[PDB]
């Protein structure tokens, strides 16, 4: 009879870039145990107080006059504010630029400048743990200022442009392991500072072509350690923020099998003790070591090793205020189905006779992160995939022997299943965020009542926006292969009819250590053509996906580009039995490492039921892992330079021979740093040798991570225009 | 009978590259009036004599033994033979490789090496006019040997790699102005050598990217002087071949408007007096000067100046045995219809007040090049377009005041309109080649009887191949605009009908000073899709084409891409009025500058009758001539660096902003030294800002001219694969 449906307008790419979808996430942070910063919601910066419904005003709409200051931060004494403004990052997030100081009420902007230098570009200044003391880095040089008027102190200047780094990560550390642009850590007392010195003099330097600069454009050189080369030298140093500012280097472990080392984690156990994680070049040996800032004597506190490699080396254990027993996380055997990542409690100074290992929890799941620990009793707060590997939920257990796990969220709000939290100083309250599968939900809760006092932010404009069009139907049809349950999702355009036929799209990431099937709210081109152009998209997480077992992670080890390839063909076959899906119009997309996988998924199924994919695409693919970063190829296939016998067959060229009639497209910016253009050039040479058919598209002189909104709209429009052409018939 | 025969074979991509379609050329060259070299036809080389059928066996099937030397020459005494094996082309024509000397009959090889040097590549050797004297250039250094057994002498070694060239042209001279790699001329007595020293010390440098060299490829630098930049500085030198062999240089003219000059043409007038043509950087002031070889003193002879530029400065003069009055080609006003090229007699020593100018040929036509002149009477032979601008005919005039121009070729063979005649020393016998409009043949004739004693070659393989395949039907439909006639050639697959519709495809090159519509025989992609799929190809010589009036040549002065495009849409409208050509299928094509012209034929013709074209493409086009060499940009637009305002209006970007639905593609190799990939990259950047659909392909690390046949056939296959998809409906 009357079949009720949406019966209204659909979702186009244009509205994706509208401010209506834009999330005004305040991302507040607890300044004290009673209140947080309460960052910008729709402009000016207020300061909410959780105790009694107090929302004080700290910064006004004067940030507009500060040359549109992108970033701002408040000093711990909430009397001075730093405003940093620039034009664009460099690698992934190079938040350099001009740093200006302003008073707490308003006014008086002064550009922070290095001594004897006018207003000049500045990489990072930041704030100390206490007072108005701060540092700043210029030209890989760390200077300290005890006060606002204090003259810059030449604390260290041994760093050089692209050769010696201190306090900041190079390309490798910022893009492979440390993942952070800032690489220095303040002592709890605001008196000592730990900084990493990276020597890149030995690293080979590659130059990126330029085609937009001038009539005679010049290449841009930076050091990029390829697979089989030597890795950049690393050292750790400790300096004082007052008095002599004495520099103390930290002695690394000297195991016979651990000649070359990387620092994957440092944390201030106290104002003089630092916990450092050192990983061998083979990445199969990790050591947690306690070092003395004032002495430099490093005492090993823990050691682990694995056959393939060590995963998740960036974690920070929860150290008590007094330096007592801490809460690490590591891979415990967890019975069968491989070893799982669980929380462990280790004494303050474990004896060499034995370790104090004790799993706080247990189960076929993992802890993504450990939030914090309450010294006032038995409370350990963490985020885990206990309910499902595809969901992140906040859990709390007891440090005492009971180890009883207490829920905090477990569907606190039915709309949202993903979760993250940030507790106050005294663990009294905590900010909580949903960000999936509903609209991102920012709220304040308390550990005792577990009740929402009020709504910090909900973005009801996003609510009416998603309720204003044909929101695509989200569902899961998980598959099962070997002794593993492989997750996946499939989308419907909310006008789905089982009788009618819909073309299929596959999207692959497959990054070893990542997950593409998660219950986090996200909107992308996928929704753009699902809602408008009527497609069904497949996200699959084959073997090698993280958070589902170390055995699953290491299945693909020394078999890159082989097993997950079977995983996605199996997923395609399983969904191909559907009567509502089209077999002739099947497409595949990928990007980054998955882009390589996207190139490797152009088969001829058997010989009679061939022509699996109609149109294919890939963005910044990797063709030879030798031509990529060493810390990745060595990690997942073993160290190169000794004829590893693993990078030959993994080259996609040997598989791209056939390419009968598949419409194949490549998107690649010219100036990519993460995944050099040489991969695309080699693939093009192979295509030419193979008489293949393709259509290349290029972005001249653009960074890899591609952080321009209008350019992103152009890219997604090009993608959908390509894909609509092959689905149309 | 129960049997029948269907249609015969058509032409495909493989057919173009099939062995049967290969053209056989003997390229015989006179040694005297009686015998010529009679170079390779199908293997062995004879020494044919015109007088009585005497073909002396000189070269046999031993050329294969020396590692298949691509090029080879014979010493002027016919006693030594030089092979050039392992030769690879760097530029359009750079015969760098290994030279080996051998005895005339067969056997006894001898590597040609400079002293104290092992087996090394040599860029060029050449031969002297007499005996066994020869030279060779190594590291841009000229070493001369009076004898084969003579030790190599450091005759001149000041040359530097890519900075100082002696005896060889740079990029600019080999490509744009001199149009030949060789830059040394032997004296008629073979006693002194005239070579041009090109200095690149003050020339800007550009680095071509490399994406395949190694795991760590690096750019290759070469000096490419852009528009308005500092051009390479040319000096001229003469080195004796006996005694001290002291070098002498000839001072150029010192005209105030001619501060920067180039040596466009040089030829030994006598064994001691040499004629040199010096042209200003503005390329609008040329001076022909006769200079003493053993002294270097230069005496100015002739001058030519035009408001736009000068054309065909490469024309080689015709001198006498005694160095008397010589023959020149000048654009004399010729009354109406603009100035025209005609032969002029200049006395041996014209007076300083006035010269002895006297035109020989007259009419609304031009002499392409003067073949030769006979002192024993009055016989000057040349080729001219007197019959038609798309035909070349041999004409012989008389130096006596009568000036009787006799056509000798005219209609010697019915299937021969284009002609190429090469006369002997005594001019009694010459060699004639057809090169169209059918299969080419080479024949021996005598200027007296015009009698074919015998045929040198007929290209029987080509005749049988064209008989076995659908030869396209050649027809002409010329157009008229203003005071200029623009010939055009539309092609048919020899099976034209009216019931079917034939898709239209325009091909444009339109290089100023060149001819694109002519009766030459050629096989290319046009032949393919006319034969394979019947896409009618339209080629027209709009404004800017040469050999049809220096007024037409100079019409597009500083007005590039503005009048030719008008003429092209005029031709398109004239042709499209025929019903058998449809509206939906309209395509454009081009290469190099024509590719840019191809990019300029995608407007929106009004708004009601939009969609002017369907699929368009280009091969390494140019969008802004500032990114081009000075010798090409300044000639037509003037010197840059002072905001010439005739460069920035030529950009196609504003004209391709709309690009609503027309498909657009680019073919461009990575290392294109002719038109840099920077042009295409900037075009793509504007298109991204223009937000229009496009495509692109890359040939990584190859030159512009596609010296390997495999790359050429891949290009042709790619072109046809693109053009088939944009028409079928």
PDB file of N, CA, C and O in Angstrom, chain A residues 204 206-207 209 211-212 214-217 226 229 627 677-678 681 684-685 688 691 693-700 710 714 717, chain B residues 204-206 209 211 215-218 224-226 229 626 678 681-682 684-685 688 691 693-698 700 713-714 717:
ATOM      1  N   UNK A 204      71.090   8.682   2.622  1.00  0.00           N
ATOM      2  CA  UNK A 204      70.996   9.181   1.245  1.00  0.00           C
ATOM      3  C   UNK A 204      69.866  10.191   1.104  1.00  0.00           C
ATOM      4  O   UNK A 204      68.824  10.088   1.755  1.00  0.00           O
ATOM      5  N   UNK A 206      67.276  12.217  -1.452  1.00  0.00           N
ATOM      6  CA  UNK A 206      66.565  12.245  -2.722  1.00  0.00           C
ATOM      7  C   UNK A 206      65.903  13.593  -2.940  1.00  0.00           C
ATOM      8  O   UNK A 206      65.523  14.282  -1.992  1.00  0.00           O
ATOM      9  N   UNK A 207      65.748  13.945  -4.210  1.00  0.00           N
ATOM     10  CA  UNK A 207      65.243  15.246  -4.616  1.00  0.00           C
ATOM     11  C   UNK A 207      63.953  15.067  -5.404  1.00  0.00           C
ATOM     12  O   UNK A 207      63.856  14.184  -6.262  1.00  0.00           O
ATOM     13  N   UNK A 209      61.135  16.558  -8.021  1.00  0.00           N
ATOM     14  CA  UNK A 209      61.052  17.542  -9.103  1.00  0.00           C
ATOM     15  C   UNK A 209      60.011  18.613  -8.821  1.00  0.00           C
ATOM     16  O   UNK A 209      59.038  18.406  -8.093  1.00  0.00           O
ATOM     17  N   UNK A 211      57.632  21.661 -10.886  1.00  0.00           N
ATOM     18  CA  UNK A 211      57.109  22.031 -12.196  1.00  0.00           C
ATOM     19  C   UNK A 211      56.185  23.238 -12.108  1.00  0.00           C
ATOM     20  O   UNK A 211      55.400  23.494 -13.024  1.00  0.00           O
ATOM     21  N   UNK A 212      56.256  23.984 -11.008  1.00  0.00           N
ATOM     22  CA  UNK A 212      55.414  25.158 -10.823  1.00  0.00           C
ATOM     23  C   UNK A 212      56.176  26.378 -10.318  1.00  0.00           C
ATOM     24  O   UNK A 212      55.706  27.505 -10.522  1.00  0.00           O
ATOM     25  N   UNK A 214      59.339  28.220 -10.975  1.00  0.00           N
ATOM     26  CA  UNK A 214      59.847  29.310 -11.801  1.00  0.00           C
ATOM     27  C   UNK A 214      60.129  28.773 -13.201  1.00  0.00           C
ATOM     28  O   UNK A 214      59.797  27.626 -13.519  1.00  0.00           O
ATOM     29  N   UNK A 215      60.736  29.613 -14.042  1.00  0.00           N
ATOM     30  CA  UNK A 215      61.111  29.193 -15.389  1.00  0.00           C
ATOM     31  C   UNK A 215      62.201  28.134 -15.332  1.00  0.00           C
ATOM     32  O   UNK A 215      62.331  27.313 -16.248  1.00  0.00           O
ATOM     33  N   UNK A 216      62.996  28.129 -14.262  1.00  0.00           N
ATOM     34  CA  UNK A 216      64.003  27.102 -14.009  1.00  0.00           C
ATOM     35  C   UNK A 216      63.754  26.548 -12.612  1.00  0.00           C
ATOM     36  O   UNK A 216      64.503  26.850 -11.670  1.00  0.00           O
ATOM     37  N   UNK A 217      62.711  25.741 -12.438  1.00  0.00           N
ATOM     38  CA  UNK A 217      62.426  25.190 -11.112  1.00  0.00           C
ATOM     39  C   UNK A 217      63.519  24.235 -10.669  1.00  0.00           C
ATOM     40  O   UNK A 217      64.181  23.585 -11.481  1.00  0.00           O
ATOM     41  N   UNK A 226      66.002   4.433   2.037  1.00  0.00           N
ATOM     42  CA  UNK A 226      65.277   3.389   1.335  1.00  0.00           C
ATOM     43  C   UNK A 226      65.564   2.033   1.976  1.00  0.00           C
ATOM     44  O   UNK A 226      66.403   1.903   2.871  1.00  0.00           O
ATOM     45  N   UNK A 229      69.265   0.303   2.907  1.00  0.00           N
ATOM     46  CA  UNK A 229      70.254   1.316   3.238  1.00  0.00           C
ATOM     47  C   UNK A 229      70.468   1.343   4.749  1.00  0.00           C
ATOM     48  O   UNK A 229      69.909   0.534   5.495  1.00  0.00           O
ATOM     49  N   UNK A 627      61.997   0.376  -2.937  1.00  0.00           N
ATOM     50  CA  UNK A 627      61.940   1.805  -3.211  1.00  0.00           C
ATOM     51  C   UNK A 627      61.095   2.565  -2.197  1.00  0.00           C
ATOM     52  O   UNK A 627      60.626   3.671  -2.494  1.00  0.00           O
ATOM     53  N   UNK A 677      57.242   9.191  -6.333  1.00  0.00           N
ATOM     54  CA  UNK A 677      56.727   9.021  -7.685  1.00  0.00           C
ATOM     55  C   UNK A 677      57.434   7.912  -8.446  1.00  0.00           C
ATOM     56  O   UNK A 677      56.908   7.449  -9.466  1.00  0.00           O
ATOM     57  N   UNK A 678      58.608   7.482  -7.979  1.00  0.00           N
ATOM     58  CA  UNK A 678      59.364   6.453  -8.683  1.00  0.00           C
ATOM     59  C   UNK A 678      58.581   5.152  -8.768  1.00  0.00           C
ATOM     60  O   UNK A 678      58.710   4.407  -9.744  1.00  0.00           O
ATOM     61  N   UNK A 681      56.294   5.601 -11.650  1.00  0.00           N
ATOM     62  CA  UNK A 681      57.060   5.575 -12.892  1.00  0.00           C
ATOM     63  C   UNK A 681      57.450   4.152 -13.272  1.00  0.00           C
ATOM     64  O   UNK A 681      57.351   3.762 -14.443  1.00  0.00           O
ATOM     65  N   UNK A 684      54.466   2.380 -14.567  1.00  0.00           N
ATOM     66  CA  UNK A 684      54.153   2.825 -15.921  1.00  0.00           C
ATOM     67  C   UNK A 684      55.076   2.162 -16.931  1.00  0.00           C
ATOM     68  O   UNK A 684      54.642   1.756 -18.016  1.00  0.00           O
ATOM     69  N   UNK A 685      56.364   2.054 -16.604  1.00  0.00           N
ATOM     70  CA  UNK A 685      57.281   1.350 -17.496  1.00  0.00           C
ATOM     71  C   UNK A 685      56.839  -0.091 -17.693  1.00  0.00           C
ATOM     72  O   UNK A 685      56.863  -0.613 -18.816  1.00  0.00           O
ATOM     73  N   UNK A 688      53.847  -0.178 -20.026  1.00  0.00           N
ATOM     74  CA  UNK A 688      54.266   0.015 -21.410  1.00  0.00           C
ATOM     75  C   UNK A 688      54.870  -1.269 -21.958  1.00  0.00           C
ATOM     76  O   UNK A 688      54.575  -1.682 -23.085  1.00  0.00           O
ATOM     77  N   UNK A 691      52.019  -3.677 -22.781  1.00  0.00           N
ATOM     78  CA  UNK A 691      50.976  -3.245 -23.717  1.00  0.00           C
ATOM     79  C   UNK A 691      49.645  -3.028 -23.000  1.00  0.00           C
ATOM     80  O   UNK A 691      48.574  -3.337 -23.528  1.00  0.00           O
ATOM     81  N   UNK A 693      46.546  -1.029 -20.705  1.00  0.00           N
ATOM     82  CA  UNK A 693      45.657   0.114 -20.859  1.00  0.00           C
ATOM     83  C   UNK A 693      45.493   0.797 -19.509  1.00  0.00           C
ATOM     84  O   UNK A 693      45.207   0.134 -18.507  1.00  0.00           O
ATOM     85  N   UNK A 694      45.676   2.115 -19.484  1.00  0.00           N
ATOM     86  CA  UNK A 694      45.528   2.880 -18.255  1.00  0.00           C
ATOM     87  C   UNK A 694      45.266   4.338 -18.596  1.00  0.00           C
ATOM     88  O   UNK A 694      45.252   4.733 -19.763  1.00  0.00           O
ATOM     89  N   UNK A 695      45.055   5.137 -17.552  1.00  0.00           N
ATOM     90  CA  UNK A 695      44.880   6.578 -17.680  1.00  0.00           C
ATOM     91  C   UNK A 695      45.388   7.240 -16.410  1.00  0.00           C
ATOM     92  O   UNK A 695      44.722   7.185 -15.371  1.00  0.00           O
ATOM     93  N   UNK A 696      46.556   7.867 -16.493  1.00  0.00           N
ATOM     94  CA  UNK A 696      47.212   8.469 -15.342  1.00  0.00           C
ATOM     95  C   UNK A 696      46.681   9.875 -15.100  1.00  0.00           C
ATOM     96  O   UNK A 696      46.364  10.604 -16.044  1.00  0.00           O
ATOM     97  N   UNK A 697      46.582  10.244 -13.827  1.00  0.00           N
ATOM     98  CA  UNK A 697      46.280  11.604 -13.410  1.00  0.00           C
ATOM     99  C   UNK A 697      47.260  12.008 -12.320  1.00  0.00           C
ATOM    100  O   UNK A 697      47.586  11.206 -11.440  1.00  0.00           O
ATOM    101  N   UNK A 698      47.729  13.249 -12.379  1.00  0.00           N
ATOM    102  CA  UNK A 698      48.840  13.694 -11.552  1.00  0.00           C
ATOM    103  C   UNK A 698      48.480  15.016 -10.888  1.00  0.00           C
ATOM    104  O   UNK A 698      47.700  15.810 -11.421  1.00  0.00           O
ATOM    105  N   UNK A 699      49.044  15.239  -9.704  1.00  0.00           N
ATOM    106  CA  UNK A 699      48.903  16.509  -8.990  1.00  0.00           C
ATOM    107  C   UNK A 699      50.274  17.157  -8.884  1.00  0.00           C
ATOM    108  O   UNK A 699      51.097  16.748  -8.046  1.00  0.00           O
ATOM    109  N   UNK A 700      50.567  18.166  -9.704  1.00  0.00           N
ATOM    110  CA  UNK A 700      51.937  18.694  -9.788  1.00  0.00           C
ATOM    111  C   UNK A 700      52.335  19.420  -8.512  1.00  0.00           C
ATOM    112  O   UNK A 700      51.644  20.333  -8.059  1.00  0.00           O
ATOM    113  N   UNK A 710      39.840  22.481  -1.044  1.00  0.00           N
ATOM    114  CA  UNK A 710      39.373  22.618  -2.421  1.00  0.00           C
ATOM    115  C   UNK A 710      40.012  21.570  -3.321  1.00  0.00           C
ATOM    116  O   UNK A 710      39.339  20.967  -4.169  1.00  0.00           O
ATOM    117  N   UNK A 714      38.278  18.573  -5.516  1.00  0.00           N
ATOM    118  CA  UNK A 714      38.625  18.245  -6.894  1.00  0.00           C
ATOM    119  C   UNK A 714      38.987  16.772  -7.034  1.00  0.00           C
ATOM    120  O   UNK A 714      38.566  16.106  -7.988  1.00  0.00           O
ATOM    121  N   UNK A 717      35.860  14.611  -6.701  1.00  0.00           N
ATOM    122  CA  UNK A 717      35.053  14.772  -7.903  1.00  0.00           C
ATOM    123  C   UNK A 717      35.638  13.981  -9.064  1.00  0.00           C
ATOM    124  O   UNK A 717      34.905  13.322  -9.809  1.00  0.00           O
TER     125      UNK A 717
ATOM    126  N   UNK B 204      71.956  29.258 -18.798  1.00  0.00           N
ATOM    127  CA  UNK B 204      71.252  28.616 -17.684  1.00  0.00           C
ATOM    128  C   UNK B 204      71.161  27.111 -17.881  1.00  0.00           C
ATOM    129  O   UNK B 204      71.275  26.596 -18.995  1.00  0.00           O
ATOM    130  N   UNK B 205      70.959  26.406 -16.772  1.00  0.00           N
ATOM    131  CA  UNK B 205      70.983  24.950 -16.736  1.00  0.00           C
ATOM    132  C   UNK B 205      69.647  24.445 -16.210  1.00  0.00           C
ATOM    133  O   UNK B 205      69.035  25.072 -15.337  1.00  0.00           O
ATOM    134  N   UNK B 206      69.179  23.329 -16.765  1.00  0.00           N
ATOM    135  CA  UNK B 206      67.990  22.650 -16.279  1.00  0.00           C
ATOM    136  C   UNK B 206      68.292  21.173 -16.076  1.00  0.00           C
ATOM    137  O   UNK B 206      69.008  20.550 -16.867  1.00  0.00           O
ATOM    138  N   UNK B 209      64.484  15.192 -14.751  1.00  0.00           N
ATOM    139  CA  UNK B 209      64.303  14.172 -13.717  1.00  0.00           C
ATOM    140  C   UNK B 209      64.564  12.774 -14.247  1.00  0.00           C
ATOM    141  O   UNK B 209      64.341  12.475 -15.421  1.00  0.00           O
ATOM    142  N   UNK B 211      63.700   8.710 -13.167  1.00  0.00           N
ATOM    143  CA  UNK B 211      62.887   7.868 -12.302  1.00  0.00           C
ATOM    144  C   UNK B 211      63.197   6.385 -12.453  1.00  0.00           C
ATOM    145  O   UNK B 211      62.474   5.559 -11.884  1.00  0.00           O
ATOM    146  N   UNK B 215      68.088   2.572  -7.580  1.00  0.00           N
ATOM    147  CA  UNK B 215      67.342   2.751  -6.340  1.00  0.00           C
ATOM    148  C   UNK B 215      67.383   4.212  -5.915  1.00  0.00           C
ATOM    149  O   UNK B 215      66.457   4.719  -5.272  1.00  0.00           O
ATOM    150  N   UNK B 216      68.446   4.914  -6.289  1.00  0.00           N
ATOM    151  CA  UNK B 216      68.593   6.327  -5.978  1.00  0.00           C
ATOM    152  C   UNK B 216      68.883   7.129  -7.241  1.00  0.00           C
ATOM    153  O   UNK B 216      70.011   7.600  -7.430  1.00  0.00           O
ATOM    154  N   UNK B 217      67.902   7.306  -8.121  1.00  0.00           N
ATOM    155  CA  UNK B 217      68.144   8.071  -9.346  1.00  0.00           C
ATOM    156  C   UNK B 217      68.353   9.548  -9.055  1.00  0.00           C
ATOM    157  O   UNK B 217      67.818  10.100  -8.091  1.00  0.00           O
ATOM    158  N   UNK B 218      69.146  10.186  -9.912  1.00  0.00           N
ATOM    159  CA  UNK B 218      69.430  11.610  -9.815  1.00  0.00           C
ATOM    160  C   UNK B 218      69.161  12.286 -11.152  1.00  0.00           C
ATOM    161  O   UNK B 218      69.168  11.646 -12.205  1.00  0.00           O
ATOM    162  N   UNK B 224      69.659  24.431 -21.168  1.00  0.00           N
ATOM    163  CA  UNK B 224      68.507  24.771 -22.000  1.00  0.00           C
ATOM    164  C   UNK B 224      68.212  26.249 -21.788  1.00  0.00           C
ATOM    165  O   UNK B 224      67.539  26.627 -20.819  1.00  0.00           O
ATOM    166  N   UNK B 225      68.706  27.116 -22.670  1.00  0.00           N
ATOM    167  CA  UNK B 225      68.431  28.555 -22.531  1.00  0.00           C
ATOM    168  C   UNK B 225      66.981  28.859 -22.876  1.00  0.00           C
ATOM    169  O   UNK B 225      66.548  28.676 -24.014  1.00  0.00           O
ATOM    170  N   UNK B 226      66.232  29.330 -21.882  1.00  0.00           N
ATOM    171  CA  UNK B 226      64.825  29.640 -22.069  1.00  0.00           C
ATOM    172  C   UNK B 226      64.661  30.928 -22.872  1.00  0.00           C
ATOM    173  O   UNK B 226      65.629  31.534 -23.342  1.00  0.00           O
ATOM    174  N   UNK B 229      66.615  34.313 -21.929  1.00  0.00           N
ATOM    175  CA  UNK B 229      67.777  34.006 -21.110  1.00  0.00           C
ATOM    176  C   UNK B 229      69.044  34.173 -21.948  1.00  0.00           C
ATOM    177  O   UNK B 229      68.995  34.543 -23.124  1.00  0.00           O
ATOM    178  N   UNK B 626      57.493  31.348 -22.558  1.00  0.00           N
ATOM    179  CA  UNK B 626      58.582  31.681 -21.645  1.00  0.00           C
ATOM    180  C   UNK B 626      59.305  30.424 -21.188  1.00  0.00           C
ATOM    181  O   UNK B 626      60.509  30.451 -20.910  1.00  0.00           O
ATOM    182  N   UNK B 678      57.426  20.153 -17.908  1.00  0.00           N
ATOM    183  CA  UNK B 678      56.934  21.255 -17.093  1.00  0.00           C
ATOM    184  C   UNK B 678      55.726  21.924 -17.737  1.00  0.00           C
ATOM    185  O   UNK B 678      54.804  22.359 -17.038  1.00  0.00           O
ATOM    186  N   UNK B 681      52.799  19.751 -16.943  1.00  0.00           N
ATOM    187  CA  UNK B 681      52.493  19.798 -15.519  1.00  0.00           C
ATOM    188  C   UNK B 681      51.788  21.095 -15.146  1.00  0.00           C
ATOM    189  O   UNK B 681      50.831  21.087 -14.364  1.00  0.00           O
ATOM    190  N   UNK B 682      52.242  22.222 -15.697  1.00  0.00           N
ATOM    191  CA  UNK B 682      51.571  23.489 -15.425  1.00  0.00           C
ATOM    192  C   UNK B 682      50.173  23.504 -16.029  1.00  0.00           C
ATOM    193  O   UNK B 682      49.235  24.059 -15.439  1.00  0.00           O
ATOM    194  N   UNK B 684      48.275  20.879 -16.287  1.00  0.00           N
ATOM    195  CA  UNK B 684      47.474  20.080 -15.367  1.00  0.00           C
ATOM    196  C   UNK B 684      47.144  20.882 -14.119  1.00  0.00           C
ATOM    197  O   UNK B 684      46.039  20.784 -13.578  1.00  0.00           O
ATOM    198  N   UNK B 685      48.099  21.680 -13.635  1.00  0.00           N
ATOM    199  CA  UNK B 685      47.836  22.525 -12.475  1.00  0.00           C
ATOM    200  C   UNK B 685      46.687  23.486 -12.750  1.00  0.00           C
ATOM    201  O   UNK B 685      45.763  23.618 -11.935  1.00  0.00           O
ATOM    202  N   UNK B 688      43.411  21.629 -12.865  1.00  0.00           N
ATOM    203  CA  UNK B 688      42.944  21.371 -11.507  1.00  0.00           C
ATOM    204  C   UNK B 688      42.291  22.618 -10.934  1.00  0.00           C
ATOM    205  O   UNK B 688      41.203  22.556 -10.349  1.00  0.00           O
ATOM    206  N   UNK B 691      39.255  22.887 -12.902  1.00  0.00           N
ATOM    207  CA  UNK B 691      38.245  21.907 -12.497  1.00  0.00           C
ATOM    208  C   UNK B 691      37.527  21.318 -13.714  1.00  0.00           C
ATOM    209  O   UNK B 691      36.311  21.441 -13.876  1.00  0.00           O
ATOM    210  N   UNK B 693      37.571  17.781 -16.577  1.00  0.00           N
ATOM    211  CA  UNK B 693      37.972  16.395 -16.769  1.00  0.00           C
ATOM    212  C   UNK B 693      39.119  16.298 -17.770  1.00  0.00           C
ATOM    213  O   UNK B 693      39.187  17.050 -18.745  1.00  0.00           O
ATOM    214  N   UNK B 694      40.026  15.354 -17.524  1.00  0.00           N
ATOM    215  CA  UNK B 694      41.213  15.216 -18.357  1.00  0.00           C
ATOM    216  C   UNK B 694      41.793  13.817 -18.207  1.00  0.00           C
ATOM    217  O   UNK B 694      41.294  12.994 -17.436  1.00  0.00           O
ATOM    218  N   UNK B 695      42.859  13.568 -18.965  1.00  0.00           N
ATOM    219  CA  UNK B 695      43.628  12.335 -18.899  1.00  0.00           C
ATOM    220  C   UNK B 695      45.080  12.651 -19.227  1.00  0.00           C
ATOM    221  O   UNK B 695      45.406  13.760 -19.658  1.00  0.00           O
ATOM    222  N   UNK B 696      45.954  11.665 -19.033  1.00  0.00           N
ATOM    223  CA  UNK B 696      47.381  11.912 -19.192  1.00  0.00           C
ATOM    224  C   UNK B 696      48.122  10.583 -19.218  1.00  0.00           C
ATOM    225  O   UNK B 696      47.706   9.614 -18.579  1.00  0.00           O
ATOM    226  N   UNK B 697      49.221  10.548 -19.974  1.00  0.00           N
ATOM    227  CA  UNK B 697      50.106   9.392 -20.033  1.00  0.00           C
ATOM    228  C   UNK B 697      51.554   9.856 -19.988  1.00  0.00           C
ATOM    229  O   UNK B 697      51.864  11.006 -20.306  1.00  0.00           O
ATOM    230  N   UNK B 698      52.440   8.945 -19.596  1.00  0.00           N
ATOM    231  CA  UNK B 698      53.845   9.250 -19.347  1.00  0.00           C
ATOM    232  C   UNK B 698      54.715   8.188 -19.998  1.00  0.00           C
ATOM    233  O   UNK B 698      54.382   6.999 -19.964  1.00  0.00           O
ATOM    234  N   UNK B 700      58.436   7.326 -19.168  1.00  0.00           N
ATOM    235  CA  UNK B 700      59.454   7.756 -18.203  1.00  0.00           C
ATOM    236  C   UNK B 700      60.869   7.535 -18.712  1.00  0.00           C
ATOM    237  O   UNK B 700      61.274   6.409 -19.013  1.00  0.00           O
ATOM    238  N   UNK B 713      55.389   2.316 -31.810  1.00  0.00           N
ATOM    239  CA  UNK B 713      54.193   1.508 -32.023  1.00  0.00           C
ATOM    240  C   UNK B 713      53.309   1.507 -30.784  1.00  0.00           C
ATOM    241  O   UNK B 713      52.079   1.470 -30.898  1.00  0.00           O
ATOM    242  N   UNK B 714      53.909   1.554 -29.592  1.00  0.00           N
ATOM    243  CA  UNK B 714      53.090   1.677 -28.392  1.00  0.00           C
ATOM    244  C   UNK B 714      52.330   2.995 -28.386  1.00  0.00           C
ATOM    245  O   UNK B 714      51.155   3.039 -28.007  1.00  0.00           O
ATOM    246  N   UNK B 717      49.445   2.631 -30.867  1.00  0.00           N
ATOM    247  CA  UNK B 717      48.387   1.810 -30.294  1.00  0.00           C
ATOM    248  C   UNK B 717      47.613   2.582 -29.239  1.00  0.00           C
ATOM    249  O   UNK B 717      46.385   2.488 -29.168  1.00  0.00           O
TER     250      UNK B 717
END
